[PDB]
From Swiss-Prot, chain A:
Protein name from the UniProt record: Protein SOF1
Originating gene: SOF1
GO molecular function: mRNA binding
Region (Disordered): 432-461
Organism of origin: Saccharomyces cerevisiae (strain ATCC 204508 / S288c) (Baker's yeast)
UniProt keyword terms in alphabetical order: Nucleus, Repeat, Ribonucleoprotein, Ribosome biogenesis, rRNA processing, WD repeat
Similarity comment text for this entry: Belongs to the WD repeat DCAF13/WDSOF1 family.
Subunit structure and binding partners: Interacts with snoRNA U3. Interacts with NOP1 and MPP10. Component of the ribosomal small subunit (SSU) processome composed of at least 40 protein subunits and snoRNA U3.
SMART domains on file: WD40 (SM00320)
One cellular component (GO) term of this entry: nucleoplasm
UniProtKB/Swiss-Prot annotation, chain C:
Function text: Involved in nucleolar processing of pre-18S ribosomal RNA.
Domain of life: Eukaryota
Range within the parent protein: 841 to 899 of 899
Name of the protein in its database record: U3 small nucleolar RNA-associated protein 14
Localization per record: Nucleus, Nucleolus
Family under the similarity heading: Belongs to the UTP14 family.
Miscellaneous information on this protein: Present with 1470 molecules/cell in log phase SD medium.
Assembly with partners or alone: Interacts with snoRNA U3. Interacts with MPP10. Component of the ribosomal small subunit (SSU) processome composed of at least 40 protein subunits and snoRNA U3.
UniProtKB/Swiss-Prot annotation, chain D:
Misc remark: Present with 13500 molecules/cell in log phase SD medium.
Record gene name: NOP56
Domain of life the protein comes from: Eukaryota
Family: Belongs to the NOP5/NOP56 family.
Subunit composition and interactions: Interacts with NOP1 and NOP58. Component of the ribosomal small subunit (SSU) processome composed of at least 40 protein subunits and snoRNA U3.
Protein's UniProt name: Nucleolar protein 56
Subcellular location: Nucleus, Nucleolus
Organism: Saccharomyces cerevisiae (strain ATCC 204508 / S288c)
Section of the entire sequence shown: 3 to 168 of 504
Swiss-Prot record, chain E:
A GO term for molecular function: snoRNA binding
Organism: Saccharomyces cerevisiae (strain ATCC 204508 / S288c) (Baker's yeast)
Coiled-coil stretches: none
Organism superkingdom: Eukaryota
Keyword terms of this UniProt record: Nucleus, Repeat, Ribonucleoprotein, Ribosome biogenesis, rRNA processing
HAT repeat residue numbers: 86-118, 123-155, 158-190
Lineage: Eukaryota, Fungi, Dikarya, Ascomycota, Saccharomycotina
Subunit structure: Component of the ribosomal small subunit (SSU) processome, or 90S pre-ribosomal particle, composed of the 35S pre-rRNA precursor, the U3 snoRNA, and at least 40 protein subunits. Component of the PWP2/UTP-B subcomplex composed of DIP2, PWP2, UTP6, UTP13, UTP18 and UTP21. Interacts with U3 snoRNA. Interacts with MPP10.
Protein's UniProt keywords contain Repeat: yes
Main location: nucleus
Name listed for the protein in its UniProt record: U3 small nucleolar RNA-associated protein 6
Location relative to the cell: Nucleus, Nucleolus
Length: 461, 458, 59, 166, 273, 182
RNA sequence: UUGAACAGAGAGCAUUUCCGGCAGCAGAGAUUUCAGCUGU
């Protein structure tokens, strides 16, 4: 009779030399591993609880802030850690966000500096030294656009006349500014929107639809010759710089405070307006928004895109900011602070990992876009654990017990009470429109994505 | 890609008794591609499996397999396995209930009189020998060799690694059967009272008290698949219980008389119950069919056990008898005792042994080795049963070579991923789904007398 | 409370949704390569360099 | 982008290749500041691609004086020309991380396609490789680095003071 | 763990190697448990280049057994399926892993180069160029690697431009050992001899002189003298004029003995002037 | 069990393998380490007695204050609990919930009165002596430590004669008579 | 902004241009592998 038993042999399972690790034999039988749904449910629940205890999003404020509340912010789209901010008392500052300290400050204007951006100024007589000088220009309500250079310690190649290399001049005030991402060009909105270049001391072209003023401006990031602007007649106007002309405008219900273009989709933009939500619009069809981001409770002051194009940040007049996944339409996250008042400017840093907010008490604050995410480099075991936990929270996302935990935040008292009376108001109007629809004959079902456009020039067929 | 052993690694799903969405269509197509890739690549691991299962095969027609002696096995197999086949002769205290840790490293014996010893049976290291002079009945380890629970005269006690008493449970009034649920951290208790008690060992909190309402609990086993408890009563009734429902999940009519013993396969598919009416019965668990009914055993089967490779060890007093491939659907797998004229379609015993002096108290297979530890009136005996253990364990579920640091970190990690007691259902895959109410289609809010004919108008 | 209330948004019926949930992505239940393919995220950025806007071959 | 790293040391020159950038904006945070103390995570940032050892204590003292007064020596020219790719001088230079802001101009005087960075990111990368030292080099140098440090410090000091044994 | 990744990277070749009916399942499980032993010893702690070398020897032995079994079972010399290159690719990757972990034993680096060269038509000479580039980056001072690199790219490929570049870069790095100088004058004499012999051959069928070797001879004398006067009298010049003239005499003796060896192995090039 | 990390202290706080809620602070363990009780369940067979006397004192409080059955039975209970020395005086029936303790009914045990009247010098050595069989209350030897005494028998706790430790203390004080055989 | 010749990198993308078929023969290195002509 032949016969054979289990010969475990102890050389394959506990190692000979003491310096090396033990063997881990695997056996992928589901008989060996029994509770495959419950075990990863509890791992997804422990991941959501670990996220809710690791959510420490406030990095730090930078510097000492300003004196009179920050109303303009501009990142530069080529360096990771440099940031220009301007306040109401005319002072602008250039910031190193690594050390959280200003390269330089500038008493730029006398009024409010109402816009500022950054440039690589293509002069055709001089050569731009972009490895030691940074350039920011800035418009105010004292009818001036000024262009400044900054001494920057980022390369150590060299070894110098920092401020105010030139002063453009308008006859009326300015209200917004944004620079083209090539070809020495910028545009300033104000009493009317002008286009400029850094060589000529006067506007190249006036590109105004009608005699109604312009409140904001953004250039496109790819297809760089497409401008967009917000006018105080609740209007959003697109301009093209091939045709050197406006292109199409829409009139909404309330006033668009800001625009930002999608850096990864080149025809989509997001508007941030005074009814308390944001609108994701396609340039090729402005007859309908392709999303509405709804969760704010007062007027949305500024919006910005992640450089990955996958989520937006959105600061509003209720003293809180909100981060939104672009495909959802409700807030993924809310950041607030008892010290933060009336966040007027929000940018999304080029790392896609930090969020810069300028409030109006004076302070500019860094936040993490993902609160539970730390910024060290990770060994492969902890990186694998973190993305395993992300995939697991993703596929158990809608279970009631982990949804009530991942959904949870502490919102201030004012925003919570405004939220619940907003809920009972919306439920009341849905009740009344359901009754009215039960009776009356032809009540059209208007979409939420169309419920906020009062009209559109150049009708669609 | 074909993989002749995929259906072990396959995973069942919901069916209704295709789509117009482009994005959802391609998402489901990616999901089906990923499921097929994952099943195939998970099933290709059987090349990487290190060891092979044991066996013994007759190689002749005169050489039957049930008449092969344990001394002949110990001569035919190696010295390490022959030294694992231990035998402790502990005569003065009572019949010894045997228990192994879930990796086969530690042994826990209890005398009927008072003698409880936790030991490393494969080294010569005992780490608790305590003589609790009242009649002990049963014991079990909790999540380790570091804690064990013993069922004493009335109260269940909990002892640490070296034998100091940690807890006296004021509930669990008269236990006779203890079993630990290791993924849920639950000590389950039943006995002479008609009550079933689930006690959380980690928090310390009595999770459930359930009226069996059927008198004292004659047998008790745990489904390793879905952690429901099969209790056998004096009705001939097995009942499947969960700590959520105060009623049994299922009640099966297994035997006549009482139910002497229950064993469940580790796949959670088959259950062997012995009654006191001299009847072994093999049950389908998932579909609740009765597979086999071996009636008229020569004397009532006092124990059953099922190995990790599906052997069936029945014990009828002095005799231990093991059948191979008895837990199958076909009628040619009904366990016989002889083959009447040499029928190949009769499941004769795979091997048998006679403990000629005594009557065996309980049976338990050693987890990852080819041994069957039977505890009897004069102590412990391991039997070399060659087909009777998973040769290829997983070393990150439970490891027979695990060290002190590995024990510490695995204890903290399994404590962290302890499953709640409410997730115990009859099927484990029912905690991701939707309700069996709440309609299966999601809803899109749009869906949310010629004179009397003249006298009509009046 | 361990099973969802209705069918979540992107699916149309619970057969589709449970076909999503039917395979565990764990280390214990897949191979190592399949585990890595199942847990790598969609957006993978580099941790310390600037993300520029997209540029296409002549739009 | 901090693509390459130049570490000068008494046994020779080392060029490292930066695998993963550390965070720029979160560079003052606690986890970023102590990942350069943990070696298991610093080896995710820095990889050694080259090490040119010196010819002896004479060339060691010559290169110690040249590194001290901020000049590119001939062994520096050799190892940088071996290791750094021929980038452009007008568009996207290759980025070398040094620790000496007045050695940088001497590096661009010799290789115009190399822009040199010594700010706080390059400083803590440099002090990470100083903190770990012999572990990064994978066994490829002759001579213990502290013994060569004792010899080079005594030689540098006696040279700088003109110590005569007459 | 990463031994799990590498071990289940090994499975498609034995899928194919069981389908092509040469190995059986019970013997391929034996080669997998040996390979499990080796992969665990490789990527665990306390690892050794002898563990790498024994893994390479085991993989070459199972490759030779696979070739023998293929010729005996299928009676073809390659099945043109996965299982005839996967195992040599595995050996090349074990070599790459070992040289990334312990880049300090030139025995292992040269075993890598020998196996990669002897792999034949299936390898790529730019793949040999890559490991020459990283080996010369790690060991610039070790001079036999420069000689071996230039010898491979002249005595096999006959690439005179790249060979001149290799020798000039090596002489840039260590202009102190005379062995690299002698092998450079040897290469230049071999190149000019092949030039004038192809001239003689094209004449017999159908300006640029040894002055290259004389100019590198001249800079050989100048820089070897400079490096010996800098090597000896090491730290400072604290030595009176007796010791300075003793030093300068000794460097003249050193340099002139090397030129004596230069003429002694210069005479045997008798096909040029 | 591992002195858990911080995200560990927070994620699970009610975990405690050592001390549960129903241990009541391990007062059974603490008082039997104090008064050195040999076996288990003595604490709870005293606690049942404490619960029974507070229950029947409760229902004697329930009955109206005029009937002789009630008043005779509460004075009888108070005199019996004085007579077994559980109390130290015949005071208020409020002491039948303030002053009856499982501690005091352990105070009436035989080793602890032995330590009280300095016959031993520790309660452990008292249990040593009375398991070795040296003492007696009146005529009869006492073998088990569970024999608690009454208020009359704290006077005739004495050793037996031929107890050699009694002989050693007699020859210590050299009053060792040996006509009385000890 | 384009063109030119030059110097290259291994860091991308095609496709039927050949080879990874067989001998005869000489050559190469330490009895195994390596290198080209005339046809299948």
């Amino acid at each position: 009779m032949k016969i054979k038993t289990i010969k475990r042999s102890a050389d394959d399972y506990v190692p000979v030399k003491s310096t090396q690790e033990s063997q881990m034999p695997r056996n992928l039988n589901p008989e060996l591993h029994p509770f495959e749904r419950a075990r990863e449910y509890t791992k997804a629940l422990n991941a959501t609880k670990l996220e809710r205890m690791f959510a420490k999003p406030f990095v730090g404020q930078l510097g000492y802030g300003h004196r009179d509340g920050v109303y303009a912010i501009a990142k530069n789209y080529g360096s990771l850690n440099k940031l220009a901010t301007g306040s109401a008392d005319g002072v602008i500052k250039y910031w190193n966000m690594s050390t959280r300290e200003e390269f330089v400050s500038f008493k730029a204007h006398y009024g409010l500096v109402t816009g500022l951006c950054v440039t690589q100024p293509r002069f055709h007589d001089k050569k731009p030294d972009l490895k030691s000088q940074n350039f920011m220009l800035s418009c105010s309500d004292d009818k001036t656009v000024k262009l400044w250079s900054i001494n920057v310690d980022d390369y150590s190649n060299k070894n110098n006349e920092e401020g105010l290399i030139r002063t453009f001049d308008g006859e009326s005030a300015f209200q917004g500014i944004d620079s083209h991402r090539e070809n020495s060009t910028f545009a300033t909105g104000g009493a009317k929107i002008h286009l400029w270049d850094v060589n000529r001391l006067k506007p190249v072209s006036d590109l105004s639809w009608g005699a109604d003023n312009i409140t904001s401006l953004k250039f496109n990031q790819n297809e760089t010759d497409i401008l967009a602007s917000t006018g105080s007649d609740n209007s959003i106007v697109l301009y093209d710089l091939r045709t050197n002309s406006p292109t199409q405008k829409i009139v909404q219900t309330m006033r668009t405070n800001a625009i930002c273009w999608n850096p990864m989709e080149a025809f989509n933009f997001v508007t941030a307006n005074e009814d308390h939500n944001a609108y994701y619009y396609d340039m090729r069809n402005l007859s309908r928004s392709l999303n509405v981001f709804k969760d704010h409770v007062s007027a949305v002051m500024d919006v910005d895109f992640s450089p990955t194009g996958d989520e937006i940040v959105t600061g509003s007049y209720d003293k809180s900011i909100r981060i939104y996944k672009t495909n959802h339409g409700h807030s993924r996250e809310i950041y607030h602070t008892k010290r933060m008042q009336h966040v007027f400017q929000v940018k999304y840093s080029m790392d896609s990992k930090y969020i810069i907010s300028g409030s109006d008490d004076g302070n500019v604050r860094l936040w993490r876009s993902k609160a539970w995410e730390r910024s060290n480099v990770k060994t492969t075991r902890e990186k694998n654990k973190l993305e395993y936990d992300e995939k697991l929270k993703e596929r158990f996302r809608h279970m009631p017990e982990i949804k009530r935990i991942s959904r949870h935040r502490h919102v201030p008292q004012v925003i919570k009470k405004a939220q619940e009376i907003k809920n009972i108001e919306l439920s009341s109007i849905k009740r009344r429109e359901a009754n009215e629809r039960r009776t009356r004959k032809d009540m059209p079902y208007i979409s939420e994505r169309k419920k906020q456009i009062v009209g559109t020039v150049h009708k669609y067929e | 890609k074909e993989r002749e052993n995929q259906n072990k690694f396959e995973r069942s799903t919901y069916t209704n008794n295709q789509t117009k969405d482009k994005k959802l269509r391609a998402g489901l197509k990616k999901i089906d591609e990923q499921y097929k890739k994952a099943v195939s690549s998970a099933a290709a691991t059987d090349y990487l499996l290190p060891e092979s299962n044991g066996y013994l095969e007759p190689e002749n027609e005169l050489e039957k397999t049930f008449k092969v002696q344990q001394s002949e096995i110990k001569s035919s197999v190696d010295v390490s396995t022959a030294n694992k086949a231990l035998d402790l002769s502990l005569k003065e205290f009572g019949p010894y209930h045997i228990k192994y840790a879930k990796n086969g490293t530690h042994l826990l014996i209890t005398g009927r009189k008072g003698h409880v010893a936790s030991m490393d049976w494969r080294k010569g290291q005992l780490r608790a020998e305590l003589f609790l002079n009242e009649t002990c009945h049963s014991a079990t380890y909790l999540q380790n060799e570091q804690y064990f629970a013993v069922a004493q005269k009335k109260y269940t006690f909990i002892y640490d690694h070296e034998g100091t008493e940690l807890h006296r449970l004021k509930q669990h009034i008269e236990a006779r059967h203890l079993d630990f649920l290791p993924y849920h951290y639950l000590l389950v208790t039943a006995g002479e009272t008609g009550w079933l008690k689930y006690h959380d060992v980690s928090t310390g909190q009595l999770v459930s008290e359930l009226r069996t309402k059927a008198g004292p609990t004659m047998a008790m086993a745990q489904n390793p698949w879905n952690a429901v408890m099969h209790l056998g009563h004096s009705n001939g009734t097995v009942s499947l219980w969960s700590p959520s429902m105060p009623e049994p999940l299922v009640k099966l009519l297994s035997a006549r008389g009482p139910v002497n013993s229950i064993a469940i396969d580790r796949s959670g598919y088959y259950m062997a119950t012995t009654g006191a009416d001299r009847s072994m019965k093999i049950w389908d668990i998932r579909n609740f069919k009765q597979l086999h009914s071996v009636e008229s055993l020569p004397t009532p089967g006092t124990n059953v056990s099922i190995s990790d490779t599906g052997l069936l060890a029945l014990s009828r007093g002095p005799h231990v008898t093991l059948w191979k491939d008895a837990l199958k659907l076909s009628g040619d797998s009904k366990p016989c005792f002889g083959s009447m004229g040499g029928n190949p379609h009769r499941n004769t015993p795979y091997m048998s042994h006679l403990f000629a002096g005594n009557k065996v108290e309980n049976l338990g297979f050693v987890p990852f080795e080819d041994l069957l530890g039977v505890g009897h009136q004069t102590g412990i005996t391991n039997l070399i049963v060659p087909g009777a253990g998973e040769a290829n364990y997983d070393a990150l579920e439970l490891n027979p070579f695990e060290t002190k640091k590995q024990r510490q970190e695995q204890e903290v990690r399994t404590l962290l991923n302890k499953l709640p007691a409410d997730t115990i259902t009859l099927d484990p895959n029912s905690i991701g789904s939707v309700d069996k109410r709440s309609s299966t289609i999601r809803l899109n809010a749009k869906d949310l007398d010629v004179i009397e004919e003249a006298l009509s108008r009046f | 409370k361990y099973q969802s209330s209705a069918v979540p948004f992107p699916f149309e019926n619970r057969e589709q949704y449970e076909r999503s949930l039917r395979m565990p992505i764990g280390q214990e239940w897949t191979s190592r390569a399949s585990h890595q393919e199942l847990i790598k995220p969609r957006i993978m950025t580099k941790p310390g360099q600037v993300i520029d806007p997209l540029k296409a071959p002549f739009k | 982008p901090i693509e390459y790293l130049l570490f000068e040391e008494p046994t020779g020159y080392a060029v490292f290749k930066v695998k993963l950038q550390q965070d720029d904006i979160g560079s003052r945070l606690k986890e970023v500041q102590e990942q350069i103390n943990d070696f298991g995570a610093f080896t995710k940032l820095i990889e050694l691609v080259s090490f040119a050892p010196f010819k002896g204590a004479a060339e060691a003292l010559e290169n110690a004086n040249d590194i001290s007064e901020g000049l590119v020596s001939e062994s520096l020219k050799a190892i940088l020309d071996l290791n750094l790719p021929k980038a452009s001088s007008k568009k996207k230079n290759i980025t070398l991380a040094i620790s000496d802001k007045n050695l940088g101009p001497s590096i661009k005087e010799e290789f115009p396609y190399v822009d040199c960075i010594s700010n706080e990111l390059a400083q803590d990368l440099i002090r990470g490789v100083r903190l770990h030292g012999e572990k990064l080099f994978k066994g490829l140098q002759s001579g213990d680095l502290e013994r060569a440090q004792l010899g080079l410090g005594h030689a540098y000091s006696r040279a700088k003071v003109k110590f005569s044994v007459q | 763990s990463k031994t799990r990744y590498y071990l289940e990277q090994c499975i498609p070749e034995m899928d194919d190697l069981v389908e092509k009916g040469l190995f059986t399942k019970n013997e391929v499980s034996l080669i997998m448990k040996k390979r499990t032993d080796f992969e665990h010893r490789l990527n665990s702690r306390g690892s050794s280049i002898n563990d790498y070398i024994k893994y390479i020897n085991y993989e070459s032995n199972v490759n030779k057994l696979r070739a023998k079994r293929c010729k005996r079972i299928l009676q073809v010399k390659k099945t043109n399926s996965l299982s005839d290159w996967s195992i040599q690719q595995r050996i090349g990757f074990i070599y790459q892993r070992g040289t990334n972990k312990f880049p300090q034993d030139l025995k292992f680096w040269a075993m890598y180069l020998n196996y990669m060269k002897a792999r034949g038509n299936q390898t790529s000479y730019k793949k040999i160029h890559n490991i020459y580039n990283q080996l010369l980056k790690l060991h610039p001072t070790n001079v036999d690697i420069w000689i071996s690199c230039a010898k491979y790219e002249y005595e096999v490929h006959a690439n005179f431009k790249s060979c001149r570049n290799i020798f000039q870069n090596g002489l840039r790095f260590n202009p102190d050992v005379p062995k690299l100088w002698y092998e450079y004058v040897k290469f230049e004499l071999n190149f000019i001899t092949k030039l004038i012999n192809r001239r003689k051959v094209m004449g017999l069928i159908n300006a640029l002189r040894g002055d290259i070797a004389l100019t590198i001879f001249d800079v050989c004398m100048k820089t070897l003298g400079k490096h010996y006067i800098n090597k000896h009298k090491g730290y400072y010049a604290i030595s009176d004029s007796k010791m300075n003239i003793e030093l300068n005499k000794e460097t003249l003796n050193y340099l002139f003995s090397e030129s004596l060896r230069y003429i002694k192995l210069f005479d045997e090039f008798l096909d040029l002037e | 069990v591992r002195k858990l990390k911080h995200h560990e202290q927070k994620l699970l706080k009610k975990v405690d393998f050592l001390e549960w809620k129903q241990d009541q602070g391990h007062r059974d363990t603490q008082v039997m380490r104090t008064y050195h009780i040999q076996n288990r369940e003595d604490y709870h067979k005293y606690n049942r007695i404490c619960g029974d006397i507070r229950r029947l004192a409760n229902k004697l409080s329930l009955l109206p204050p005029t009937d002789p059955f009630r008043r005779k039975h509460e004075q009888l209970l108070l005199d019996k609990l004085y007579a077994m020395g559980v109390l130290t005086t015949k005071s208020k029936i409020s002491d039948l919930e303030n002053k009856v303790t499982v501690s005091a009914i352990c105070r009436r045990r035989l080793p602890v009165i032995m330590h009280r009247l300095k016959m031993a010098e520790t309660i452990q050595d008292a249990v040593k002596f009375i398991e070795q069989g040296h003492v007696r209350v009146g005529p009869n030897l006492i073998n088990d430590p569970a024999y608690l005494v009454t208020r009359n028998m704290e006077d005739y706790v004495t050793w037996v004669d031929n107890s050699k430790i009694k002989k050693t203390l007699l020859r210590y004080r050299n009053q060792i008579d040996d006509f009385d055989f000890s």
